[PDB]
Every structure is written in C-alpha cells, then in structure tokens.
Scaffold this active site. Structure first.
Site, PDB file in Angstrom:
ATOM      1  N   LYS A 191       0.876  -1.173   0.000  1.00 39.64           N
ATOM      2  CA  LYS A 191       0.000   0.000   0.000  1.00 39.64           C
ATOM      3  C   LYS A 191       0.919   1.230   0.000  1.00 39.64           C
ATOM      4  CE  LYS A 191      -3.275   3.028   0.821  1.00 39.64           C
ATOM      5  NZ  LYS A 191      -4.403   3.314  -0.121  1.00 39.64           N
TER       6      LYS A 191
ATOM      7  N   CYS B 135      -2.097  10.485  -6.280  1.00 38.25           N
ATOM      8  CA  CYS B 135      -3.172  10.139  -5.331  1.00 38.25           C
ATOM      9  C   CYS B 135      -4.250  11.224  -5.479  1.00 38.25           C
ATOM     10  CB  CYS B 135      -2.672  10.097  -3.892  1.00 38.25           C
ATOM     11  SG  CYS B 135      -4.016   9.694  -2.774  1.00 38.25           S
TER      12      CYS B 135
HETATM   13  C1  LIG Z   1      -9.491   0.782  -2.688  1.00 32.38           C
HETATM   14  C2  LIG Z   1      -8.417   1.425  -3.597  1.00 32.38           C
HETATM   15  C3  LIG Z   1      -7.261   1.961  -3.036  1.00 32.38           C
HETATM   16  C4  LIG Z   1      -6.265   2.359  -3.876  1.00 32.38           C
HETATM   17  N1  LIG Z   1      -5.098   2.831  -3.313  1.00 32.38           N
HETATM   18  C5  LIG Z   1      -4.048   3.120  -4.146  1.00 32.38           C
HETATM   19  C6  LIG Z   1      -2.783   3.392  -3.472  1.00 32.38           C
HETATM   20  O1  LIG Z   1      -2.547   3.430  -2.248  1.00 32.38           O
HETATM   21  N2  LIG Z   1      -1.738   3.694  -4.360  1.00 32.38           N
HETATM   22  C7  LIG Z   1      -1.871   3.734  -5.736  1.00 32.38           C
HETATM   23  O2  LIG Z   1      -0.901   4.029  -6.399  1.00 32.38           O
HETATM   24  N3  LIG Z   1      -3.109   3.475  -6.240  1.00 32.38           N
HETATM   25  C8  LIG Z   1      -4.210   3.122  -5.554  1.00 32.38           C
HETATM   26  N4  LIG Z   1      -5.395   2.765  -6.092  1.00 32.38           N
HETATM   27  C9  LIG Z   1      -5.537   2.836  -7.452  1.00 32.38           C
HETATM   28  C10 LIG Z   1      -4.983   1.537  -8.160  1.00 32.38           C
HETATM   29  O3  LIG Z   1      -3.767   0.963  -7.752  1.00 32.38           O
HETATM   30  C11 LIG Z   1      -5.333   1.355  -9.652  1.00 32.38           C
HETATM   31  O4  LIG Z   1      -4.448   2.275 -10.263  1.00 32.38           O
HETATM   32  C12 LIG Z   1      -6.803   1.626  -9.909  1.00 32.38           C
HETATM   33  O5  LIG Z   1      -7.770   1.176  -9.007  1.00 32.38           O
HETATM   34  C13 LIG Z   1      -7.125   1.372 -11.378  1.00 32.38           C
HETATM   35  O6  LIG Z   1      -7.268  -0.076 -11.519  1.00 32.38           O
HETATM   36  P1  LIG Z   1      -8.568  -0.956 -11.379  1.00 32.38           P
HETATM   37  O7  LIG Z   1      -9.411  -0.515 -12.566  1.00 32.38           O
HETATM   38  O8  LIG Z   1      -8.134  -2.390 -11.533  1.00 32.38           O
HETATM   39  O9  LIG Z   1      -9.143  -0.644 -10.105  1.00 32.38           O
HETATM   40  C14 LIG Z   1      -6.403   2.276  -5.276  1.00 32.38           C
HETATM   41  C15 LIG Z   1      -7.564   1.767  -5.826  1.00 32.38           C
HETATM   42  C16 LIG Z   1      -8.557   1.325  -5.001  1.00 32.38           C
HETATM   43  C17 LIG Z   1      -9.789   0.606  -5.603  1.00 32.38           C
HETATM   44  O1  LIG Z   2      -5.480   5.832  -0.610  1.00 29.75           O
HETATM   45  C1  LIG Z   2      -6.195   6.385  -1.481  1.00 29.75           C
HETATM   46  O2  LIG Z   2      -7.238   7.049  -1.302  1.00 29.75           O
HETATM   47  C2  LIG Z   2      -5.765   6.230  -2.936  1.00 29.75           C
HETATM   48  C3  LIG Z   2      -4.510   6.497  -3.358  1.00 29.75           C
HETATM   49  C4  LIG Z   2      -4.205   6.503  -4.777  1.00 29.75           C
HETATM   50  O3  LIG Z   2      -3.115   6.816  -5.243  1.00 29.75           O
HETATM   51  N1  LIG Z   2      -5.262   6.120  -5.592  1.00 29.75           N
HETATM   52  C5  LIG Z   2      -6.538   5.763  -5.184  1.00 29.75           C
HETATM   53  O4  LIG Z   2      -7.425   5.427  -5.980  1.00 29.75           O
HETATM   54  N2  LIG Z   2      -6.742   5.799  -3.812  1.00 29.75           N
END
Ligand SMILES: Cc1cc2nc3c(=O)[nH]c(=O)nc-3n(C[C@H](O)[C@H](O)[C@H](O)COP(=O)(O)O)c2cc1C
Ligand SMILES: O=C(O)c1cc(=O)[nH]c(=O)[nH]1
Ligand SMILES: Cc1cc2nc3c(=O)[nH]c(=O)nc-3n(C[C@H](O)[C@H](O)[C@H](O)COP(=O)(O)O)c2cc1C
Ligand SMILES: O=C(O)c1cc(=O)[nH]c(=O)[nH]1
Lengths: 311, 311
Positions: free
Chosen positions: A43, A130
C-alpha cells in the site's frame, strides 16, 4: 507460458495486485505471497501512520468502484521492516515492489533517501497521482513540479524506481510527459491510477455514496479501461525502450489482460476486481489468458507483446 | 411538469440532442424540431465545409461509444442561413442553439463576429474541447489561452454565449476554471464533451476499431457518467448563479437525467444514446423522468434541482 522479464528480474507471470488493494497489513501481503500472483506491491505509505478518510470511503459499483481512502497505511517503517525481513528469507523469486506517496516533495525525498540507504533490493514505485487527499492536487498534472522532483530524486537514488501516473486525455500531454520522463534512468511507468474525482449517486436517497470530499472519489474498474489502454499505448510509443510499462486499469478477465499486453504493458496490476474477488482472481485470470494464447497459437507473451495493429 | 427556464427562455422540458449527434443536415435538424426534444443544437461548425476523418470513425460499444469524427460539417454559412430562416417562422417556442468550433482563435472570433452582426437571436455554444482533430490540442486544457480568447470575445459579443468544456479531473482545475469563467457575462457552461483519447480494441483482430489517429477517440456513454456528474456538480458549486449549466454525459434513462438535475444541471443533452436510439428517445426519457418525479411526489424540477445531499 507467461514467463516475464521486467526490470532485469524474471517473474512467473505478469500479474500483480494494484497498490492499495489487499496489501495494507503483513497478513494481506502474506496472502498475496501465497497466491498465484507473479509479484506484489505494498500500500502506498507515508512517513507517519494514517487512519485515512472517514467511512464510508469505498463502494462497489456495478461497473467498477469509487473510493476516497485518503491513504490509510501503517507507516513507512512498518513496510520497510517487512520487506527487509522478507529479503533474508529467499522464499520468493523476483523482487517485491514498495510504494510510497509522500504528502509533499520533502516527504518523498526523505523516504527515498531511507530506501537508498537501506539494504532494500526490490523495486520502488513513486506515486505521483493520489487523488483522494483533501487539499492536495495531483503532482503529475503539474509538469514543472514533476520534472523538478525527478531531477532531485535522481541526484542520489540509484535503485530501481518506477512512477505511478494519473490518466492523461490529450496527446500533447503524453508528448510533454514522455519528454520529461525520457531524460531520466527510470525503470518504468505505471499507467494508470484511478480516474480522479468522479461522482456516484444513490437516486433513491438523493445523495452521494461516500463520505469524504462531498462524495468525489477515484473511479476504477470497467469504467476506465478505454482510458487505461490509451495511456499504456500512448506511452509505449513515446518512451525510450529502456523504460518499461506496467498497465493498470479495468483488468478483470484474461481478455482485458491480453489487450493491455497487446498495447505494450509488461507487468499488469489488478485493483477493483481483486478487491471484489480476493487473491483467487490470479488463478482464474492466468487460466483465461493462457486459453486465449492457446487458441491463437501463442506460446509466449513475446509473440504479441506491443503488436496492436492500426487500421 | 418538466417546464424549464434557461437563459431567460422557457422550454417545455430540459432535453436536447448533444452537438454532433443527429444535427448535421437540415433534414436531421427538422427531425429534431419534430421530436419531443425541448430544444436542439447544431453540429459544431467551421468557416469552410469539412468532410471529417476517414472511416470507420464511430463505433457503438456495449458501454458507450468511441468516435473521432474530425468535425465533419456543412460549413458556418449553411447553419446560419438555416437558423435565420427558422427564426422568421415562429413555429417553435424557445431559441435554437448554434455550435461553433473554429480550428483557431482567429476562426472562432470571425464566426462570433458574423453571429453578432446577423439577426440571429438564438443561443451560441463555443466548443473549446474538440478532441478529434489531429495536431490540435483541446483549448480548454490551456487555462491561459482560454482566458485570453474569452477576454477578446467579450469585447464585442453581446448575445447569449455558453462554452462546451472537456472533463476536468482535479479539484484545483475546477477552482482555476471557475475563477476564469466567473469574470465574464457568460450564459452557461456545458459539461462535458467526450472523455478525450481513449482506446478500444478488437482482441480477435488484435487491432483498434477506428481509423483516425491510430485508434484514439473520444469516449461517451455509460463509461463517462461518473465524470460527467462530477463536472456538473463541481461547477454548480463554484460558478456565480448567473451562469447556468447544461449537463451532458452518460444520459440514457430518466434516472440518469434525474441525477444530472440533482447535481445542478438545468438543460440536459443526449449524445450516444440518441445516436443509438434516434429521436424517439426523447419521448421515452421524458416519461421515465416524470415517473420518477411522480413516485417522489415532485411536481416540478425546482423541487429537487441542485439538491444533492452529502453524507
Ligand atoms: C481501494 C483502492 C485503493 C487504492 N489505493 C491506491 C494506493 O494506495 N496507491 C496507488 O498508487 N493506487 C491506488 N489505487 C488505485 C490503483 O492501484 C489502480 O491504479 C486503480 O484502481 C485502477 O485499476 P482498477 O481498474 O483495476 O481498479 C487504489 C484503488 C482502489 C480501488
Ligand atoms: O489511498 C487512497 O485514497 C488512494 C490512493 C491513490 O493513489 N489512488 C486511489 O485510488 N486511492
Ligand atoms: C458522434 C459524436 C459526435 C460528436 N460531435 C460533437 C460536436 O460536434 N461538438 C461537441 O461539442 N460535441 C460533440 N460530441 C460530444 C457530445 O456532444 C457529448 O458531449 C458526448 O458524446 C458526451 O455525451 P454522451 O455520453 O451522451 O455521448 C460528439 C459525440 C459523438 C458521439
Ligand atoms: O466532430 C468530432 O470529432 C467531435 C467534436 C467534439 O467536440 N467532440 C467529439 O466527441 N467529437
């Protein structure tokens, strides 16, 4: 047949969890290590432990998900100790990925300096996108600020570094970004983070569905695949070949995986679908991709990697 | 019960076609005049007739559409003569909307001067977000260029003018834009144009589905609703009340319409769904919205307009 070479490391398959999904605690991470995922990422962390935004802050949608987590994480030291301990026990082929998302340039440099000083031999992902922290705009949408940070980072960071980018929607932005990125010894770029500040509404209650920021949150899942593929493809044709690409966004079936690879992604990250399905998704999607490859007579990803045809 | 007041004009209902869909020729426009649409808008025009991009340039997708039309239109004069002739025959309550999308600032000012000089008494929409012309970035993503153009336009244009904007994804961008827009006597802002430069892939053929720009095109339909609603809502809470909002994006059922109105949109434009269904869609969606209003005991749009609740 999914053997992959990325950042000079060999992985059993290109699948990983996307940062932020199923990787908050050591217990989550151990579950990822035990799954069929080819690699895994932590994370995004900050110097201090963070509780994140108030609940509800994540909602499963029929076509994806919306979230405004607010970077809840157990702190930089917690993740660093875990990866260092894990390095000693060579019970895993391929490096572990470590994500950092400092609230300021200063915080990012401080974390990178600590990673540089440590014995960490894995890969670092700098999160410049983010979109869920109130009062903090996305650094990667500010080209000048992004270049300045990277210039400073590369005056001391010598270990493998990749950047997590927000989606871009104008070709000129890809041109400007690729030119900024091409001047650095970056290991990779990961496209894309969730589409920033969307809104989902419950019509019956006539209200938003998440508590933070009046309901505005990052969108992921099926909604974003067209944008995700475009970003992977646009960078694949503009970045110097030394910089590889991790494709993230809308992956839930082997076919979605196939499309990202065809565009030019090397490693693949699953967010929303993993959050909904659990680590068992890796087993299913690997079988789906191999089936597609079998039907087409492909024996390795190199057979079609980056070979998307134009009309 | 859908009576609406917009730009000091009264409309039977808030529904319109989105510019570019079912409004290329006089025949298309006459069909819109004959439908249940509360108002209608012409295809964005340029000074000279344009054939547009090579085919295929539009594809219906399960979750929306992708297109790279390239501004095919019959030229500014063709549309101007038609609206002027139509003004004489008062066979329609409410002004007609006229969209212009010059390839340069110079071309836009030239068209606006001609509209200013003519007897046109309808509403003009300045398109600052066409994402399908090769080599031309979206003007609205360049804040400085956008402000300069508007300053010049308002030194002579006195008739009703609205701007069609691309979607924004960072709250700071909404802040910067709202501040630029609030200084002008604008009639309205229309959010949003299609999400720029997405990519759709045919996995069997391993190729893109549209011919122009290597397959990159604007995305519309269900894919974009979360972004569309966010844009309407973000501007609704930042713009001076004198500037109304037209909500466009992902509208295909009365419920989608209801959500846009709840966010603060006054008029609603239907693109993708109208392209798929034809003018009969207006008849359907009006019934769907009224049904929703009936169940909730609402008798007019003013009962819930802009009343989206936060948690
Ligand atoms: C619950 C949640 C938390 C996320 N937290 C991060 C995070 O801490 N760091 C990050 O780079 N992206 C974060 N993302 C974004 C993803 O890593 C990814 O780029 C994004 O969800 C797009 O992919 P998906 O269509 O498979 O969800 C998060 C996404 C979700 C759903
Ligand atoms: O921790 C989050 O809210 C978060 C971080 C990030 O880079 N991307 C995202 O979708 N959520
Ligand atoms: C075939 C097509 C052509 C379009 N042409 C225009 C145009 O000329 N001018 C404009 O401002 N928007 C144009 N758009 C974008 C829309 O008016 C609308 O903003 C968009 O499609 C989002 O709405 P939707 O989800 O209902 O499609 C076009 C959209 C489509 C599908
Ligand atoms: O004509 C086009 O290609 C076009 C123009 C515009 O503004 N938006 C869109 O989606 N298509």
């Amino acid at each position: 047949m999914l053997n992959t070479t990325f950042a000079n490391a060999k992985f059993a398959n290109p699948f990983m969890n996307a940062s932020g999904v199923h990787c908050m605690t050591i217990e989550d991470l151990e579950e990822l290590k035990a799954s069929q995922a080819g690699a895994y990422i932590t994370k995004s962390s900050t110097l201090e432990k963070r509780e994140g935004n108030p609940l509800p802050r994540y909602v499963d949608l029929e076509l994806g998900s919306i979230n405004s987590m607010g970077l809840p994480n157990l702190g930089f030291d917690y993740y660093l100790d875990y990866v260092l301990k894990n390095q000693k026990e060579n019970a895993q082929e391929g490096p572990i990925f470590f994500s950092i998302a400092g609230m300021s340039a200063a915080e990012n440099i401080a974390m990178l300096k600590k990673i540089q000083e440590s014995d960490f031999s894995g890969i670092t992902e700098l999160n410049l996108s983010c979109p869920n922290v109130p009062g903090k705009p996305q650094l990667a949408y500010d080209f000048e600020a992004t270049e300045k940070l990277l210039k400073e980072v590369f005056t001391f960071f010598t270990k493998p570094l990749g950047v997590k980018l927000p989606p871009y929607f104008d070709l000129v932005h890809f041109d400007i970004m690729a030119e900024i990125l091409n001047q650095f010894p970056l290991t990779y770029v990961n496209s894309v983070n969730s589409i920033g500040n969307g809104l989902f509404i419950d019509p019956e209650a006539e209200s938003v569905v998440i508590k933070p920021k009046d309901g505005f949150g990052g969108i992921g899942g099926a909604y974003i695949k067209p944008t995700a593929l475009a970003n992977v493809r646009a960078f694949y044709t503009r970045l110097k070949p030394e910089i590889q690409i991790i494709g993230t966004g809308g992956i839930e079936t082997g076919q979605d995986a196939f499309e990202h690879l065809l565009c030019g992604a090397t490693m693949l990250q699953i967010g929303t679908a993993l959050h909904k399905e659990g680590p068992a998704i890796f087993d299913r999607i690997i079988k789906e991709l191999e089936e597609i490859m079998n039907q087409k007579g492909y024996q390795s990803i190199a057979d079609f990697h980056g070979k998307l045809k134009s009309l």
